[PDB]
Scaffold this motif. Structure first.
Motif, PDB file in Angstrom:
ATOM      1  N   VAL B  40       0.883  -1.297  -0.060  1.00  0.00           N
ATOM      2  CA  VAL B  40      -0.062  -0.095  -0.155  1.00  0.00           C
ATOM      3  C   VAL B  40       0.776   1.156  -0.033  1.00  0.00           C
ATOM      4  CG1 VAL B  40      -1.848  -1.169   1.325  1.00  0.00           C
ATOM      5  CG2 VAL B  40      -0.240   0.211   2.581  1.00  0.00           C
ATOM      6  N   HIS B  41       0.516   2.362  -0.675  1.00  0.00           N
ATOM      7  CA  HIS B  41       1.182   3.619  -0.426  1.00  0.00           C
ATOM      8  C   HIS B  41       1.029   4.124   0.847  1.00  0.00           C
ATOM      9  CE1 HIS B  41       0.608   2.776  -4.869  1.00  0.00           C
ATOM     10  NE2 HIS B  41       1.675   3.328  -5.069  1.00  0.00           N
ATOM     11  N   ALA B  42       1.739   5.182   1.041  1.00  0.00           N
ATOM     12  CA  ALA B  42       1.706   5.683   2.475  1.00  0.00           C
ATOM     13  C   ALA B  42       2.663   6.964   2.449  1.00  0.00           C
ATOM     14  CB  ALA B  42       2.019   4.728   3.616  1.00  0.00           C
ATOM     15  N   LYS B  43       2.178   7.943   3.318  1.00  0.00           N
ATOM     16  CA  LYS B  43       3.317   9.127   3.643  1.00  0.00           C
ATOM     17  C   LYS B  43       4.361   8.747   4.508  1.00  0.00           C
ATOM     18  CE  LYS B  43       4.030  13.569   4.129  1.00  0.00           C
ATOM     19  NZ  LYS B  43       4.835  14.366   2.964  1.00  0.00           N
ATOM     20  N   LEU B  44       5.482   8.409   3.870  1.00  0.00           N
ATOM     21  CA  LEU B  44       6.670   8.001   4.520  1.00  0.00           C
ATOM     22  C   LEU B  44       7.974   9.055   4.547  1.00  0.00           C
ATOM     23  CD1 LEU B  44       6.889   4.628   3.214  1.00  0.00           C
ATOM     24  CD2 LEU B  44       5.774   5.294   5.290  1.00  0.00           C
ATOM     25  N   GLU B  45       8.429   9.015   5.534  1.00  0.00           N
ATOM     26  CA  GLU B  45       9.543  10.155   5.774  1.00  0.00           C
ATOM     27  C   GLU B  45      10.678   9.713   4.578  1.00  0.00           C
ATOM     28  OE1 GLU B  45      12.559   7.913   9.250  1.00  0.00           O
ATOM     29  OE2 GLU B  45      12.802  10.154   8.441  1.00  0.00           O
ATOM     30  N   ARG B 169       9.082  -0.356   2.440  1.00  0.00           N
ATOM     31  CA  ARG B 169       9.418  -0.530   3.897  1.00  0.00           C
ATOM     32  C   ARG B 169       8.570  -1.491   4.560  1.00  0.00           C
ATOM     33  NH1 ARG B 169      10.086   3.404   8.955  1.00  0.00           N
ATOM     34  NH2 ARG B 169       9.509   2.042  10.569  1.00  0.00           N
ATOM     35  N   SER B 171       8.579  -4.645   8.248  1.00  0.00           N
ATOM     36  CA  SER B 171       9.194  -5.218   9.394  1.00  0.00           C
ATOM     37  C   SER B 171       9.621  -6.698   8.931  1.00  0.00           C
ATOM     38  CB  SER B 171       8.422  -5.177  10.621  1.00  0.00           C
ATOM     39  OG  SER B 171       8.918  -5.733  11.591  1.00  0.00           O
ATOM     40  N   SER B 219       0.837 -11.671   8.503  1.00  0.00           N
ATOM     41  CA  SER B 219      -0.063 -10.669   8.509  1.00  0.00           C
ATOM     42  C   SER B 219       0.462  -9.049   8.330  1.00  0.00           C
ATOM     43  CB  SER B 219      -0.394 -10.661  10.066  1.00  0.00           C
ATOM     44  OG  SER B 219       0.554 -10.412  11.194  1.00  0.00           O
ATOM     45  N   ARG B 220       1.539  -9.006   7.666  1.00  0.00           N
ATOM     46  CA  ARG B 220       2.372  -7.901   7.173  1.00  0.00           C
ATOM     47  C   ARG B 220       1.706  -7.154   6.200  1.00  0.00           C
ATOM     48  NH1 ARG B 220       8.379 -10.121   7.506  1.00  0.00           N
ATOM     49  NH2 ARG B 220       7.191 -11.873   6.553  1.00  0.00           N
ATOM     50  N   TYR B 221       1.785  -5.932   6.044  1.00  0.00           N
ATOM     51  CA  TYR B 221       1.745  -5.218   4.830  1.00  0.00           C
ATOM     52  C   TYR B 221       3.135  -4.625   4.392  1.00  0.00           C
ATOM     53  CZ  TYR B 221      -3.004  -4.835   3.403  1.00  0.00           C
ATOM     54  OH  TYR B 221      -4.343  -5.267   2.877  1.00  0.00           O
ATOM     55  N   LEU B 223       4.875  -1.162   2.851  1.00  0.00           N
ATOM     56  CA  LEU B 223       4.630   0.031   2.696  1.00  0.00           C
ATOM     57  C   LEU B 223       5.286   0.762   1.563  1.00  0.00           C
ATOM     58  CD1 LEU B 223       4.205   1.939   6.032  1.00  0.00           C
ATOM     59  CD2 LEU B 223       2.617   0.378   4.597  1.00  0.00           C
TER      60      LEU B 223
END
Ligand SMILES: [Zn+2]
Ligand SMILES: [Zn+2]
Lengths: 225, 225
Positions: B40-45, B169, B171, B219-221, B223
């Protein structure tokens, strides 16, 4: 050697107690503080919730929570996979924190797919109007650990969800031993309500808080629908 | 007791080789297939990369990879934390997949904060123009396992990164034993290039593929910035 929320068998020692509890010391544990430093917005799928009535469910005081068993056939669909609702149960105060603050009460809806992979829906409660479906369960709640009663009523777990279905999503664990990871957590943003009396009856029956402390987020982010 | 990428001590049996390798069977392992289904897209630093030259680094063939030791003082800053670059090393074919596809080559830049927490940057290579940093290392890389040489040159790992710094990104874990979890993975979107000769010499020295098979996302996504 019963694990507990306090004392020598409390949450800091869980992994020591039993070889099966090794997960409790690892890197993707729940619950977490939902705070701005590591939550981001994302385009997440709509929640797909397909719940039927449970006819005469069993209600168990297992010494750590009040757990309500659910009859098969109700499920959520996430990422294409069906997770069947198995049971729901309660924590006071909430296990998840919202920007560092507790809610007075939290319900966990535990689901498993056909291979046994787990997904939990968390619902927060705020003090307010007595929840009347809660009142059906509270009326018959066994007061002592290791006790089970059969509720002589139908109940639909949908009535313990908010109508608004925006949510937080992250990858975590069970919050009680054995603390298995790989758990999909879906936490609904909108709380529903329970009365102060309903919350306090649960607390006196539990006799102590039954929430695990929040755990390090580590290298995870929390997603917001 | 020795591990490898094939046979009785290959990836499916790593956890049996050593009690310290218990991580290798858990639920947040790396690498993964970077797939549309769970991305999924996201606002990442923005990535904050502060690499200086490494003077005359050690180059080791440890039987599993070619590893380049990096001199102290270069770091990334993620989530406010300084992770110091310790070493980078290589896999052929790539460890991460995109849409089920391998790249011919992948570099991992391994960083650790002051308490030993790990962050890894992954860079994909496609076959193309020769890379000039790789050329210096490849000129003197040890051809047999258990050998070390000093490079007689300065190099800057920043020249092994793409100009475009968009990234995935998630985990995850180390991809070799002990497979420790809690690893922050940063995989750069844009591949850079190595020549056919560079890819062939590495594969020839490794004798066999040296990539761990991709692991269940559970269970991860993932980013995407
Ligand atoms: Zn729970
Ligand atoms: Zn690697």
């Amino acid at each position: 050697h019963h694990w507990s929320y306090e004392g020598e068998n409390g949450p800091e020692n869980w992994a020591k107690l039993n070889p099966e509890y090794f997960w409790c010391n690892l890197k993707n544990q729940s619950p977490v503080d939902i705070s701005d430093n590591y939550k981001v917005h994302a385009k997440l799928e709509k929640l797909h919730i397909n719940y039927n009535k449970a006819v005469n469910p069993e209600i168990v005081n297992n010494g750590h929570t009040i757990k309500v068993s659910y009859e098969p056939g109700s499920y959520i669909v996430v990422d294409g996979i069906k997770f069947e609702l198995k049971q729901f149960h309660f924590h006071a105060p909430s296990e998840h924190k919202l920007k560092g603050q507790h809610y007075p009460f939290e319900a966990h809806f535990v689901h498993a797919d056909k291979h046994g992979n787990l997904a939990v829906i968390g619902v927060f409660f705020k003090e307010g109007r007595e929840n009347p479906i809660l009142e059906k369960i509270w009326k018959v709640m066994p007061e002592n650990a290791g006790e089970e009663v059969k509720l002589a009523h139908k109940i639909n777990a949908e009535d313990l969800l908010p109508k608004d279905r925006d949510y937080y999503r992250y990858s975590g664990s069970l919050t009680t031993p054995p603390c298995t990871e790989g758990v999909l957590w879906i936490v609904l943003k909108q709380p529903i309500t329970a009365s102060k009396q309903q919350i306090e009856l649960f607390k006196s029956i539990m006799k102590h808080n039954n929430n695990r402390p929040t755990q390090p987020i580590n290298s995870r982010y929390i997603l917001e629908s």
